[PDB]
Design a protein around this ligand. Sequence first.
Ligand SMILES: NCc1ccc(C(F)(F)F)cc1
Length: 330
Amino acid sequence: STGSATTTPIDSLDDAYITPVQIGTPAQTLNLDFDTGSSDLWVFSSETTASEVDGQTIYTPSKSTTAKLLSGATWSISYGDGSSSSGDVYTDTVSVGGLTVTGQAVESAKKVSSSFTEDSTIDGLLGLAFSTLNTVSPTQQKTFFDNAKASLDSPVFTADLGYHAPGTYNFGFIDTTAYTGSITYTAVSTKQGFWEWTSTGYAVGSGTFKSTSIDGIADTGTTLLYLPATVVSAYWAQVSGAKSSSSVGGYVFPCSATLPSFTFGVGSARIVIPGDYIDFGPISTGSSSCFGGIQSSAGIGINIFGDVALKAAFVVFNGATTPTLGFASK
Ligand SMILES: NCc1ccc(C(F)(F)F)cc1
């Protein structure tokens, strides 16, 4: 079997992407943020504290004939920004773009952090990292992808994120019309539960390629590109007037500047991020200072190839027994 679903940016900056997901019987459609950096499927629900819900569509297990309470199971997650949520667990039928999994763990939020409440367009997260990171206790649960793996034609999913435009998540097949050239595959380490890989180097604009190993994770759930301080300094040094700002929390640049492209290596292949993808607009309404899409990972502890990088490529998440990541130009 296969599935295919359109994913849509939530705002004009591509801060995140939402994908419609059908939960329950009859279907309740929620717009979820597909996150290859986490492994929980959690949703706003009828159980969420009413004061913490502002315009989200909620999952109502009592209206689903296939929902079953997973007795005694709880979950609690905290993300890399101090985002957190927690609650109890149901099992229910979950379908993505025609692909159906029965008995999927659906984690119902009783409390969510304020950053989720203020984001009316995201009804929950669908985690696509490895199941070892799932937070359900005492019995850890499988991700949607792990549950679907057996039924899939091929144990893969692909991410084709658009620049200021809709894109596609496909499950079980590789659309050979969606990319150009060849797909370059690279080894994945699962030791931390992430889609972790090693980039072979980088270039700034038309500069010479610097061969150097950058270990990082492919994370559709993170907006920006977070790289070591040395790399990020070399990039912003080519932008007249750019500086690292303590009060803003990262590199900013004059909105009038034109940004150079950024190239990262995948084996012997090169993926080019156009400079326009790195512009995240004014730091505040009316400001002439703009926020950069490439930032330092020094405070995070891990390098993150977020949406800024991934949307420049067609990306294959190969969940075979030896997992690999594939990158192609598009
Ligand atoms: N998109 C989920 C996510 C968020 C933050 C982190 C890290 F890097 F902070 F641990 C990993 C994964």
